[PDB]
Design a protein around this ligand. Structure first.
Ligand SMILES: CC(=O)N[C@H]1[C@H]([C@H](O)[C@H](O)CO)OC(C(=O)O)=C[C@@H]1O
Ligand SMILES: CC(=O)N[C@H]1[C@H]([C@H](O)[C@H](O)CO)OC(C(=O)O)=C[C@@H]1O
Ligand SMILES: CC(=O)N[C@H]1[C@H]([C@H](O)[C@H](O)CO)OC(C(=O)O)=C[C@@H]1O
Ligand SMILES: CC(=O)N[C@H]1[C@H]([C@H](O)[C@H](O)CO)OC(C(=O)O)=C[C@@H]1O
Ligand SMILES: *[C@@H]1O[C@H](CO)[C@@H](O)[C@H](O)[C@H]1NC(C)=O
Ligand SMILES: *[C@@H]1O[C@H](CO)[C@@H](O)[C@H](O)[C@H]1NC(C)=O
Ligand SMILES: *[C@@H]1O[C@H](CO)[C@@H](O)[C@H](O)[C@H]1NC(C)=O
Ligand SMILES: *[C@@H]1O[C@H](CO)[C@@H](O)[C@H](O)[C@H]1NC(C)=O
Ligand SMILES: [Ca+2]
Ligand SMILES: [Ca+2]
Ligand SMILES: [Ca+2]
Ligand SMILES: [Ca+2]
Ligand SMILES: [Ca+2]
Lengths: 390, 390, 390, 390
């Protein structure tokens, strides 16, 4: 039957370029004839032959009559959906996988694992699907909105690896990692180190031995919690990224947090899920990251790179690698993912571009994608082209 | 070729949890751009790779101009349709299998058998289709609305079993079982025992030797007729369920029916198709059941379980195992089905949540799905989210 | 690679029953959200695993703005389209095969052959497609609307067989048969016998040696031209059906044409394509036919059968086998086709039910299907359920 | 694996005939229910089993609210999209391949290569994708709207060739050819000869050793630049076509350009992409070409052919071979492509028929297809049937 997937060396290239924009609300005009789904938290995950574009829908379309409440994060109607990457997630193109207000999914080389969380806030539930079958669940351990990545889980040799977290969005939220094989949790991994608050980890393989994640600390800092998870020992350690180029939003000016790598600094409250993807070369490792152009608002999105070093000890500024979204455009969640070419993996960053008109109208998002290709500098930015009044 | 399906041991787990809501009319607003079909009697049946969500459509969409008559049960337009489970059943997503106002379907491991009943009330006709080909029929034996399950039929080693019945809705309706192989009736089974009214049986495998069904008595009792069909001998016997937890609607208060297990009791007229599925373990069998929260109306739905014992003689109350649909929400027909995982079968109960605004507007239904998933207790309920005025 | 298809013995059964109604305009309401295509001349043809539902579209949808001219038969916009049988031929479900205002198609066991005719009336052109590729053409020989069957062609061992005709609709139109293999015309067959006018032949296999067709004579008679085509010698002979049950519309009363089988009789001018399908048993042959209930109008449709005999010499009345469409409903073109079960062929008759409101509105049709299944008598009729004002 | 594609001898035939019209806006009326995408620069490319119809969309549908700017050629929203040939390119039928305002694509026998150009005018970028993976880029060399073919690239034995150009629309635009294998540029070919302005080349195989292209000169001449690229040596030479039948638009009267074959002539400013395809026979090669009926406007389209000779030195008029589009109808870009039959290749010419109502309304296009089919002469023309006011 198919081989299990492993991370491979990345395809050759030294810059990212604009790849693709999925802007479903370019067709949502009241005079139009389409039914784009209202969604937020999009992410992409690829198998050997295909990529799926996932999101959490509010189970409502534009145009339609169910806009009220689409700016809320959790309720009894949100579902995890997907379409083949390159299709436009409408009512008929999408597949509804499970009721969920937090999600993840990944392919292990043989089948898709789908993860969704739902249940009441004080006692939510991780639910796992392998293909068509519901196979396992995991309980709330801190009884305060158990939740997961909002981006792809990561499989190697049939073992997938997922961050989950539970606890207060303004206080302690210690994450755990689940090791899942054929839809069933075979190991729970309790991290060591700086564990006070880790959520929405964007994870990827640095090698066949290590999974790394750049996460969100919604409570204490604008520096991102950076997980190193050893896949051979199933152990994990977390420490704050030490770079002066703070990747969260909100954040203080770069380099303004004085003290050791561990100092939390200022404007720590609040956060945003950030993009992070690995470029694995024979001798070296590129870590590519994204952050908003604004320090305080979810506007714009810029690309940054650092080759090698130790993200927990390196204070060096990340190298600015191009404007993906200008400050005039929305820049909300961003995530890494990798496309499987024939012999090598292609690193990409996807950007959630939310159309926000506040609670009195529909709330949904476009997804912009940039991927490593060729050499040079990043050339063009992305606009959604959507007028929310139509 | 592919080999034939057999029931396997159920996947590990001890509670049901909210899996999926298919609510097509969340997209049926007059100002929206979708075409959900108007349906009732949904059910799901799965083969080794995928599941199909079936329903009997009135051959009309919302928004549309044919809402009159969609609250009738039988006419010349109703058709059995399906979509792959997970898709919204719209005009374009759906497949129209055959003209029918009562239906069933099941997969034997190699192909789908589809079953539909249409024809005049005094002379209806069972029609069987195997894949694309129409292969056989069975005639009315009591000339009073020949009808079938409204849920999956069941196949073992190539032989599929189906309940059919015929007779008065408020009098005698003696069912029979047809044994069907590659779309042709190879045997008729005439049940013995308590036989005066059995309809809409929800059937599943208790083992490789026994099919059991929890049925509806629309005339005489609020107890469900419980069929035990021996697959090795092709003989069936029926007796009423003796549990004090009466599963029909309408029903008297639990435990108020005095006298031996077979006593009919009061409030027997009327009925509802009920959910029933098996959890097969090595040394134990769980029988999961659903019934409305309201004793007299199709409102709410809760789950019950009992392990082992004999349904025909056990008077004990079933164990309440969670509220799937609150009193506030519609709880109409429910049904069991099993999803095939790699090595084990996952039992589920689906619930038809009818949008009933009376005879003056459209009448259709959402389908909610709960499956055996991990451990603990059932955590959340399902709402349709539909405002019928839009 | 796949085996070539051959006709097999028909599946067991002795009556036809209502199978399926495809009524695309049940969704064409101005307040609805669907795009059913405007079409006429539907027909169905099946391969080993699937059937396609073909029609000639006017390249316009309901609701829409291009109704004017949809009651005309030939123009530069008509195209041959198809969908999988059981889907609803809308703008997005359909596939456009080629520009055509007359068509046919069949599967040879390996690939689909598509035939369409277009060009000016005085010099039209047969065009042949095998799969995706355009492979051959045939010229007009009488320069008066070269045209073909409007129903399936018939393949045996890779050789397909198609009727074409050319000439005046009110005078002589001598047909020819094309023998096509892998999309290319390998033989032209000139019939003998009564050849003055033959068009719209509905053809099928009576055995591996003979193809038979019941055709339309638009000029001279209400008796149908009946072709016997020997597949081993590639020769064909045509004579009028001798039965007193005249199958054309318009027609005189049954049995009123006195004289030998060859007498044309009265009300010969005008015609309609009629259904005809074979039931091949080990020792005997059933010939099933359809005709309108009205003698003069395209209203209603009745089924008739005759086992064995010689249609060219037998004066015997055909046995009435049931009302498929009542006189209150439209009954326009009808055609035979066969569905491939596992070991045997299932004969069916499809009926074009046109929604005709004259030239000031849209003109299109539903397709009703009846197939041989089980024993007894035909039980229920078909209505389109369409109100042309919505 | 699958083996690589090579050009084969063309299928037998001697005239082209009307094959297929894809006219998406026949379904775009404000009162209809469809969503045809607004596109320009359609082209078709085929692999062994299927063909894809590509176009550059403005990421907008009709009816819709984003008609402004759909008459511009380049912006941040244009995307290369495709549907399987035969499908209508709507919002849901289409696949969005990549952000691009100039494109190309071709199949090498194992996978699709997709090519798109986007980026600022002064610094655009060729992006290549192989299946799902983004694999390579090529930068602007003259910093003035780097651009490519708007028609299929061409693969032989795994190596695909593509024309690119860069430079002034009204001055020097020296093209180059890229040789691409599994999505990566393995060679750049710098043509020799008459090189001052070559763009929008329509290229195909004259044999296994030569690719020829008929191109556009937007600055200096109404003669088409004609490329001969030697696949064995990866060298290319360009000279102007010497035929008195000038194929560009605008153009002077046929045969009015005095002096040697290379003379530029008058009315050289402006241009149009032109149809060109090869018919390869054992001892003879036919070169089929299309040009507008009007000498100065994009109206009408007729077909021409010449067998053998050398385009660079032959002054002879080409043979008029039929009117594909009347003067009455729009005739904009045209392109060649070949469909793969079982044993031979079918040459076709497709025509973009733009709906131009000026800058105040939507601007999009229908695609008409003519292919080599049987013998005789071309019989009918194509109309779009679209009323732009609906
Ligand atoms: C499970 C859940 O509610 N996730 C929400 C998340 C959460 O509130 C925060 O991460 C603190 O824990 O925040 C956001 C947000 O746009 O910022 C959207 C997510 O839907
Ligand atoms: C074949 C048929 O009519 N089935 C109908 C069934 C029947 O009336 C009853 O089971 C008595 O026989 O009842 C109901 C119902 O909602 O209660 C709906 C079904 O469509
Ligand atoms: C090719 C063509 O025009 N076919 C037309 C056919 C023809 O006019 C007649 O068969 C005389 O030849 O008649 C009819 C009709 O409903 O009666 C519809 C067909 O579209
Ligand atoms: C890349 C680009 O802009 N292409 C445009 C092209 C270009 O302007 C000309 O070929 C001079 O270079 O012209 C046209 C045109 O309809 O004539 C449409 C193309 O979209
Ligand atoms: C990871 O391991 C697999 C075999 O297990 C190997 O083929 C692959 O190239 C390795 N990837 C990296 C990044 O070293
Ligand atoms: C049923 O029978 C098959 C073999 O016929 C066996 O593989 C399967 O495990 C059995 N299932 C149960 C529940 O006994
Ligand atoms: C026709 O011939 C094939 C073999 O060529 C045979 O299998 C089939 O059964 C025959 N059909 C009939 C109707 O005799
Ligand atoms: C091209 O080359 C292949 C073998 O490489 C051959 O099969 C094919 O027929 C050749 N085509 C032409 C036009 O010569
Ligand atoms: Ca659709
Ligand atoms: Ca923070
Ligand atoms: Ca009852
Ligand atoms: Ca006649
Ligand atoms: Ca020019």
């Amino acid at each position: 039957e198919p081989e299990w997937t492993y991370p491979r060396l990345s395809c050759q290239g030294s810059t990212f370029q604009k790849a693709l924009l999925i802007s479903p609300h370019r067709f949502g005009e009241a005079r139009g004839n389409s039914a784009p789904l209202i969604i937020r938290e999009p992410f992409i995950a690829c198998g050997p032959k295909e990529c799926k574009h996932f999101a959490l829908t509010h189970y409502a379309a534009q145009p339609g009559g169910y806009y009220n409440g689409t700016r809320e994060d959790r309720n009894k109607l949100r579902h995890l959906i997907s379409v083949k990457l390159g299709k436009i997630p409408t009512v008929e193109n999408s597949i509804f996988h499970m009721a969920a207000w937090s999600g993840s999914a990944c392919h292990d080389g043989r089948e898709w694992t789908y993860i969704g969380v739902d249940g009441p806030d004080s006692n939510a539930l991780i639910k796992i699907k392998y293909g068509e079958a519901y196979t396992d669940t995991y309980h709330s351990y801190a009884n305060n909105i158990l939740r997961t990545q909002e981006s792809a889980c990561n499989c190697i040799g049939g073992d997938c690896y997922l961050m989950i977290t539970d606890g207060s969005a303004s206080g302690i939220s210690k994450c755990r990692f689940l090791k899942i094989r054929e839809g069933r949790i075979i190991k729970e991994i309790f991290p060591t180190g700086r564990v006070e608050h880790t959520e929405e980890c964007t994870c990827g393989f640095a090698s066949n031995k290590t999974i790394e994640c750049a996460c969100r600390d919604n409570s204490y800092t604008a520096k991102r919690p950076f997980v190193k998870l050893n896949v051979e020992t199933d152990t994990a350690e977390i420490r704050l990224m030490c770079t002066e180029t703070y990747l969260d939003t909100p954040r203080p000016d770069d380099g303004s947090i004085t003290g050791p790598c561990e100092s939390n600094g200022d404007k720590g409250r609040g956060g945003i899920k950030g993009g992070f993807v690995h470029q694995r070369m024979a001798s070296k490792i590129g870590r590519w990251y994204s952050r908003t152009m604004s320090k305080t608002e979810r506007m714009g999105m810029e690309l940054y790179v650092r080759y090698d070093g130790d993200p927990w000890t390196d204070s060096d500024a990340l190298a600015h690698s191009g404007v993906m979204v200008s400050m005039k455009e929305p820049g909300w969640y961003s995530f890494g993912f990798e496309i499987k070419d024939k012999k090598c993996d292609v690193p990409c960053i996807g950007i959630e571009m939310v159309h926000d008109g506040g609670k009195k109208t529909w709330h949904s998002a476009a997804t912009a994608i940039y991927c490593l290709m060729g050499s040079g500098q990043l050339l063009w930015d992305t606009v959604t082209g959507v007028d929310m009044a139509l």
